[PDB]
Design an enzyme around this catalytic site. Structure first.
Site, PDB file in Angstrom:
ATOM      1  N   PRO A 166     -40.294  19.499 -12.710  1.00 50.78           N
ATOM      2  CA  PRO A 166     -40.381  19.028 -14.097  1.00 50.78           C
ATOM      3  C   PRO A 166     -39.084  18.345 -14.552  1.00 50.78           C
ATOM      4  CG  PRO A 166     -39.928  21.374 -14.066  1.00 50.78           C
ATOM      5  CD  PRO A 166     -40.109  20.961 -12.625  1.00 50.78           C
ATOM      6  N   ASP A 167     -39.204  17.422 -15.497  1.00 51.71           N
ATOM      7  CA  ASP A 167     -38.051  16.897 -16.202  1.00 51.71           C
ATOM      8  C   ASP A 167     -37.722  17.811 -17.399  1.00 51.71           C
ATOM      9  OD1 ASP A 167     -39.606  16.250 -18.424  1.00 51.71           O
ATOM     10  OD2 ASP A 167     -39.630  14.099 -18.005  1.00 51.71           O
ATOM     11  N   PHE A 168     -36.852  17.338 -18.294  1.00 52.39           N
ATOM     12  CA  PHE A 168     -36.414  18.146 -19.424  1.00 52.39           C
ATOM     13  C   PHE A 168     -37.142  17.839 -20.718  1.00 52.39           C
ATOM     14  CE2 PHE A 168     -32.781  18.762 -16.637  1.00 52.39           C
ATOM     15  CZ  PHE A 168     -32.496  20.100 -16.850  1.00 52.39           C
ATOM     16  N   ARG A 169     -37.217  16.552 -21.062  1.00 50.60           N
ATOM     17  CA  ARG A 169     -37.551  16.157 -22.429  1.00 50.60           C
ATOM     18  C   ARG A 169     -38.880  15.426 -22.588  1.00 50.60           C
ATOM     19  NH1 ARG A 169     -32.266  15.831 -21.458  1.00 50.60           N
ATOM     20  NH2 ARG A 169     -30.934  17.193 -22.749  1.00 50.60           N
ATOM     21  N   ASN A 176     -29.182  15.226 -11.520  1.00 53.46           N
ATOM     22  CA  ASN A 176     -30.020  16.248 -10.904  1.00 53.46           C
ATOM     23  C   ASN A 176     -29.247  17.180  -9.951  1.00 53.46           C
ATOM     24  OD1 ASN A 176     -32.102  14.869 -12.275  1.00 53.46           O
ATOM     25  ND2 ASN A 176     -32.894  13.894 -10.411  1.00 53.46           N
ATOM     26  N   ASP A 189     -31.231  18.937  -7.642  1.00 59.87           N
ATOM     27  CA  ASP A 189     -32.247  19.179  -6.609  1.00 59.87           C
ATOM     28  C   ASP A 189     -31.847  18.751  -5.195  1.00 59.87           C
ATOM     29  OD1 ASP A 189     -32.860  16.310  -6.595  1.00 59.87           O
ATOM     30  OD2 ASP A 189     -34.381  16.633  -8.144  1.00 59.87           O
ATOM     31  N   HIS A 239     -23.727  16.429 -12.687  1.00 57.86           N
ATOM     32  CA  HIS A 239     -24.012  17.737 -13.315  1.00 57.86           C
ATOM     33  C   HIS A 239     -23.989  18.913 -12.332  1.00 57.86           C
ATOM     34  CE1 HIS A 239     -26.079  15.562 -16.947  1.00 57.86           C
ATOM     35  NE2 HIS A 239     -24.769  15.388 -16.912  1.00 57.86           N
ATOM     36  N   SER A 281     -33.453   9.873 -19.819  1.00 56.76           N
ATOM     37  CA  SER A 281     -33.571   9.537 -21.242  1.00 56.76           C
ATOM     38  C   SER A 281     -32.238   9.116 -21.859  1.00 56.76           C
ATOM     39  CB  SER A 281     -34.155  10.718 -22.022  1.00 56.76           C
ATOM     40  OG  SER A 281     -33.269  11.832 -22.030  1.00 56.76           O
ATOM     41  N   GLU A 294     -40.444   5.284 -20.388  1.00 61.53           N
ATOM     42  CA  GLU A 294     -40.177   4.828 -21.755  1.00 61.53           C
ATOM     43  C   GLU A 294     -38.825   4.108 -21.791  1.00 61.53           C
ATOM     44  OE1 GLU A 294     -39.496   8.182 -24.352  1.00 61.53           O
ATOM     45  OE2 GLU A 294     -38.135   9.124 -22.892  1.00 61.53           O
TER      46      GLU A 294
HETATM   47  N1  AR6 Z   1     -42.290   9.658 -12.786  1.00 60.24           N
HETATM   48  C1  AR6 Z   1     -41.519   9.108 -13.742  1.00 60.24           C
HETATM   49  N2  AR6 Z   1     -41.230   7.792 -13.721  1.00 60.24           N
HETATM   50  C2  AR6 Z   1     -40.451   7.210 -14.637  1.00 60.24           C
HETATM   51  N3  AR6 Z   1     -39.916   7.891 -15.661  1.00 60.24           N
HETATM   52  C3  AR6 Z   1     -40.134   9.227 -15.799  1.00 60.24           C
HETATM   53  C4  AR6 Z   1     -40.970   9.933 -14.827  1.00 60.24           C
HETATM   54  N4  AR6 Z   1     -41.036  11.227 -15.222  1.00 60.24           N
HETATM   55  C5  AR6 Z   1     -40.276  11.344 -16.350  1.00 60.24           C
HETATM   56  N5  AR6 Z   1     -39.767  10.141 -16.695  1.00 60.24           N
HETATM   57  C6  AR6 Z   1     -38.859   9.810 -17.792  1.00 60.24           C
HETATM   58  O1  AR6 Z   1     -37.631  10.337 -17.297  1.00 60.24           O
HETATM   59  C7  AR6 Z   1     -36.769  10.719 -18.362  1.00 60.24           C
HETATM   60  C8  AR6 Z   1     -36.260  12.126 -18.114  1.00 60.24           C
HETATM   61  O2  AR6 Z   1     -35.315  12.442 -19.132  1.00 60.24           O
HETATM   62  P1  AR6 Z   1     -34.852  13.957 -19.348  1.00 60.24           P
HETATM   63  O3  AR6 Z   1     -36.067  14.823 -19.184  1.00 60.24           O
HETATM   64  O4  AR6 Z   1     -34.082  13.996 -20.656  1.00 60.24           O
HETATM   65  O5  AR6 Z   1     -33.921  14.210 -18.076  1.00 60.24           O
HETATM   66  P2  AR6 Z   1     -32.419  13.690 -17.850  1.00 60.24           P
HETATM   67  O6  AR6 Z   1     -32.138  13.818 -16.367  1.00 60.24           O
HETATM   68  O7  AR6 Z   1     -32.189  12.368 -18.549  1.00 60.24           O
HETATM   69  O8  AR6 Z   1     -31.571  14.841 -18.568  1.00 60.24           O
HETATM   70  C9  AR6 Z   1     -30.136  14.799 -18.519  1.00 60.24           C
HETATM   71  C10 AR6 Z   1     -29.547  16.193 -18.607  1.00 60.24           C
HETATM   72  O9  AR6 Z   1     -30.026  16.950 -19.747  1.00 60.24           O
HETATM   73  C11 AR6 Z   1     -30.285  18.294 -19.341  1.00 60.24           C
HETATM   74  O10 AR6 Z   1     -29.740  19.210 -20.280  1.00 60.24           O
HETATM   75  C12 AR6 Z   1     -29.622  18.400 -17.981  1.00 60.24           C
HETATM   76  O11 AR6 Z   1     -28.208  18.607 -18.164  1.00 60.24           O
HETATM   77  C13 AR6 Z   1     -29.901  17.032 -17.406  1.00 60.24           C
HETATM   78  O12 AR6 Z   1     -29.109  16.736 -16.246  1.00 60.24           O
HETATM   79  C14 AR6 Z   1     -37.594  10.604 -19.621  1.00 60.24           C
HETATM   80  O13 AR6 Z   1     -37.112   9.435 -20.238  1.00 60.24           O
HETATM   81  C15 AR6 Z   1     -39.039  10.458 -19.147  1.00 60.24           C
HETATM   82  O14 AR6 Z   1     -39.813   9.576 -19.950  1.00 60.24           O
HETATM   83  N1  4I5 Z   2     -34.303  17.562 -10.834  1.00 60.57           N
HETATM   84  C1  4I5 Z   2     -33.275  18.256 -11.294  1.00 60.57           C
HETATM   85  O1  4I5 Z   2     -32.363  18.671 -10.570  1.00 60.57           O
HETATM   86  C2  4I5 Z   2     -33.210  18.498 -12.827  1.00 60.57           C
HETATM   87  C3  4I5 Z   2     -34.531  19.077 -13.369  1.00 60.57           C
HETATM   88  C4  4I5 Z   2     -34.996  20.407 -12.818  1.00 60.57           C
HETATM   89  C5  4I5 Z   2     -34.298  21.624 -13.386  1.00 60.57           C
HETATM   90  C6  4I5 Z   2     -32.848  21.815 -12.934  1.00 60.57           C
HETATM   91  C7  4I5 Z   2     -31.894  20.714 -13.318  1.00 60.57           C
HETATM   92  C8  4I5 Z   2     -32.018  19.361 -13.212  1.00 60.57           C
HETATM   93  N2  4I5 Z   2     -30.845  18.745 -13.608  1.00 60.57           N
HETATM   94  C9  4I5 Z   2     -29.950  19.724 -14.000  1.00 60.57           C
HETATM   95  C10 4I5 Z   2     -28.653  19.616 -14.487  1.00 60.57           C
HETATM   96  C11 4I5 Z   2     -27.972  20.769 -14.844  1.00 60.57           C
HETATM   97  C12 4I5 Z   2     -28.600  21.996 -14.727  1.00 60.57           C
HETATM   98 CL1  4I5 Z   2     -27.777  23.423 -15.294  1.00 60.57          CL
HETATM   99  C13 4I5 Z   2     -29.882  22.121 -14.218  1.00 60.57           C
HETATM  100  C14 4I5 Z   2     -30.576  20.972 -13.844  1.00 60.57           C
HETATM  101  N1  4I5 Z   3     -36.114  24.670  -6.274  1.00 62.18           N
HETATM  102  C1  4I5 Z   3     -35.244  23.788  -5.806  1.00 62.18           C
HETATM  103  O1  4I5 Z   3     -35.348  23.263  -4.695  1.00 62.18           O
HETATM  104  C2  4I5 Z   3     -34.046  23.350  -6.672  1.00 62.18           C
HETATM  105  C3  4I5 Z   3     -34.265  21.913  -7.176  1.00 62.18           C
HETATM  106  C4  4I5 Z   3     -35.502  21.652  -8.021  1.00 62.18           C
HETATM  107  C5  4I5 Z   3     -35.358  22.048  -9.461  1.00 62.18           C
HETATM  108  C6  4I5 Z   3     -35.346  23.551  -9.688  1.00 62.18           C
HETATM  109  C7  4I5 Z   3     -34.165  24.276  -9.103  1.00 62.18           C
HETATM  110  C8  4I5 Z   3     -33.667  24.262  -7.834  1.00 62.18           C
HETATM  111  N2  4I5 Z   3     -32.640  25.181  -7.718  1.00 62.18           N
HETATM  112  C9  4I5 Z   3     -32.457  25.783  -8.952  1.00 62.18           C
HETATM  113  C10 4I5 Z   3     -31.536  26.736  -9.359  1.00 62.18           C
HETATM  114  C11 4I5 Z   3     -31.516  27.123 -10.689  1.00 62.18           C
HETATM  115  C12 4I5 Z   3     -32.416  26.559 -11.577  1.00 62.18           C
HETATM  116 CL1  4I5 Z   3     -32.323  26.990 -13.257  1.00 62.18          CL
HETATM  117  C13 4I5 Z   3     -33.362  25.633 -11.178  1.00 62.18           C
HETATM  118  C14 4I5 Z   3     -33.388  25.228  -9.846  1.00 62.18           C
END
Ligand code: AR6
Ligand code: 4I5
Ligand code: 4I5
Ligand code: AR6
Ligand code: 4I5
Ligand code: 4I5
Ligand code: ZN
Ligand code: ZN
Lengths: 301, 300
Positions: A41-44, A115, A117, A134, A210, A235
């Site tokens: 999953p994403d965040f927002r 990310n 991951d 991050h 985002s 978006e």
């Molecule tokens: N398959 C897809 N294809 C294109 N866009 C997508 C897809 N799925 C989702 N989106 C878009 O992808 C975007 C996902 O945005 P966010 O969910 O905010 O993730 P971040 O990585 O920017 O979050 C940054 C930090 O905030 C956290 O606290 C952690 O610290 C994170 O590291 C949206 O615009 C969706 O519309």
């Molecule tokens: N796909 C990622 O890895 C994303 C979304 C999955 C949840 C973990 C996670 C991601 N980004 C992060 C940045 C900081 C923290 Cl604490 C956790 C995460």
């Molecule tokens: N499942 C995993 O392969 C990785 C990367 C995918 C996002 C979830 C995630 C992973 N490691 C984590 C450690 C802490 C948290 Cl909060 C979330 C995760």
């Protein structure tokens, strides 16, 4: 003098720029959107994003779960979530392999990822190609600044999967993975790479983010003014009217649509499909599909 | 490029005495009005955000957040009724800016405050950018309507415990003070475009620089423009941390080895301005102005 490097503000305009001699060094800026098609999953994203799915932890607000001051008061919700999400086995996406193609074509200066991951690594990018802005879950640290005892992943995993809240063996303070929480310093590599990388970038490729958190969202403004910037995302992001509480600095955003737009392009849709579309334009589509196929099968073997 | 001879208040004072220093912009927040009895927001224990428990908010800022407001306007209108009746006097800091204006040095004061103590101290509307709005006028929140209402109308509603409603469209009506999620005044932007091109000194006082876009302003000055902070604590300076308010490199650099133009005087805004006034030979003049203006106000 404003240098006008894109002959039009489209994916086709970008592709032609990429094939030219003028485009030597590309920076990818990526977030959680590039891994959603793999099952993460994403965040927002409304409803589907992680921040709309933490009801059970009874947090004062969703961001608390990855916030350093909340963590220190109430560490349990974080470790409960980690125990849930860590097991998941995911493979890189078409978007991740597109970045591999950039690397192997001598075009990738750096991929900056928000990310944790590791799918950029799993896809074949090497440590030096990457800024994990991050943090990483690979190493862990005591949160006490006067101690900072380091612990390995096996130690952390053991604690989480024994349902024990990890404590430092020297000072008894909480221990956490080096994934960056709100309020926490970014790795030093981020700033040191940023300062030299952003003087010599010819194209920013921004994907699956985002741009809602600093300092990562500031990176778009670090590029030279003439450097084209392509967003591949569901978006538009980085383009909004100013308001009190806005994330970006004033004039720090993207400009896709205004009368003055000269260098920013938004391709709206899924990252994998946008990366496929761009590869097609570049004559790389078969190569990309071949690489994905080969690398997935290999991951299964 | 270095314009200050040293990075201290003394260096700034000598710069202010040079021919080069024609245009000074003041950037101020709630810290310049605490010595007058008005709480700031973010100081521990005393700040407003640490004292809203009774309203049972999900987080403190929700009381000045537009979406929360539409769903639950009662807390803000309750809070306003408590705070509006307080009567306060401008501070020594406020009069120091008045002195800047009268010495022909003040290009603009950008304030995040709605207390109007800048105006009361003698600054005119032309000298001011009320960046976070004003209570003097009120508007219906509906973008299709935007009916204006004056202060008298708003007070009648507040003090009769009636949630203000637009007489046309029945939408909520609020004072033109800027909430989280709201647009800043047009004036903020038009002035910003023009003011920061040829600015010779930034004077930042009594603000944690914790909200955008106001926090961006410091980075709008040319790179050679010195910047002096007078504040209880350092503000605008840190390493990159997740969730930071400042854009990367848009902050202040007081203490690094590359520090070349930013000065932080830590202490009370009032004493800071006195110390600077002193170094410029204005100390007696300022003290005279303050005394007379405070006497004038006392005389009601
Ligand atoms: N398959 C897809 N294809 C294109 N866009 C997508 C897809 N799925 C989702 N989106 C878009 O992808 C975007 C996902 O945005 P966010 O969910 O905010 O993730 P971040 O990585 O920017 O979050 C940054 C930090 O905030 C956290 O606290 C952690 O610290 C994170 O590291 C949206 O615009 C969706 O519309
Ligand atoms: N796909 C990622 O890895 C994303 C979304 C999955 C949840 C973990 C996670 C991601 N980004 C992060 C940045 C900081 C923290 Cl604490 C956790 C995460
Ligand atoms: N499942 C995993 O392969 C990785 C990367 C995918 C996002 C979830 C995630 C992973 N490691 C984590 C450690 C802490 C948290 Cl909060 C979330 C995760
Ligand atoms: N007497 C004093 N002398 C020197 N410094 C002081 C004094 N009193 C307080 N300080 C410092 O002054 C600073 C007060 O900072 P904050 O309380 O964040 O107020 P803002 O105006 O920046 O809040 C901005 C917006 O946020 C809101 O949402 C509204 O929208 C506001 O308009 C701190 O650094 C104190 O250490
Ligand atoms: N009392 C007043 O001199 C002014 C300025 C001081 C701060 C409180 C304050 C005033 N007017 C207000 C209207 C609404 C709110 Cl929420 C707060 C206030
Ligand atoms: N001394 C001020 O005026 C400060 C602190 C007192 C409370 C009201 C207040 C201030 N600044 C503001 C900016 C916006 C809003 Cl909604 C309210 C305020
Ligand atoms: Zn320890
Ligand atoms: Zn109306």
């Amino acid at each position: 003098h404003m240098e006008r490097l894109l002959d039009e503000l489209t994916l086709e305009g970008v592709a032609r720029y990429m094939q030219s001699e003028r485009c030597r060094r590309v920076i990818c800026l990526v977030g959680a959107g590039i891994s959603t098609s793999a099952g993460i999953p994403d965040f927002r994203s409304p409803s589907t994003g992680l921040y709309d799915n933490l009801e059970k932890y009874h947090l004062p607000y969703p961001e608390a779960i990855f916030e350093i001051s909340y963590f220190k008061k109430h560490p349990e919700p974080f470790f409960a979530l980690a125990k849930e999400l860590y097991p998941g086995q995911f493979k890189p996406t078409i978007c991740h392999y597109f970045m591999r193609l950039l690397k192997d074509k001598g075009l990738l200066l750096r991929c900056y990822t928000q990310n944790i991951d590791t799918l950029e690594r799993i896809a074949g990018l090497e440590q030096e190609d990457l800024v994990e802005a991050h943090g990483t879950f690979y190493t862990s640290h005591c949160v006490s600044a006067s101690c900072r005892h380091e612990y390995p992943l096996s130690w952390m995993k053991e604690k989480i999967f024994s349902e024990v809240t990890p404590k430092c063996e020297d000072c008894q303070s909480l221990v956490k993975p080096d994934i960056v929480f709100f309020g926490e310093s970014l790795p030093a590599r981020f700033f040191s790479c940023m300062q030299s990388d952003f003087l010599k970038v010819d194209l920013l490729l921004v994907m699956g983010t985002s741009l809602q958190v600093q300092p990562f969202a500031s990176l778009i403004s670090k590029a030279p003014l003439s450097t084209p910037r392509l967003l591949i995302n569901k978006e538009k992001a980085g383009q909004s009217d100013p308001f009190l509480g806005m994330i970006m600095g004033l004039g720090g955003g993207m400009d896709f649509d205004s009368k003055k737009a000269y260098r920013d392009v938004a391709w709206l849709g899924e990252c994998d499909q946008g990366c496929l579309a761009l590869a097609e334009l570049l004559g790389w589509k078969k190569e990309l599909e071949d690489l994905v196929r080969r690398e997935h099968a290999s991951i299964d073997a």
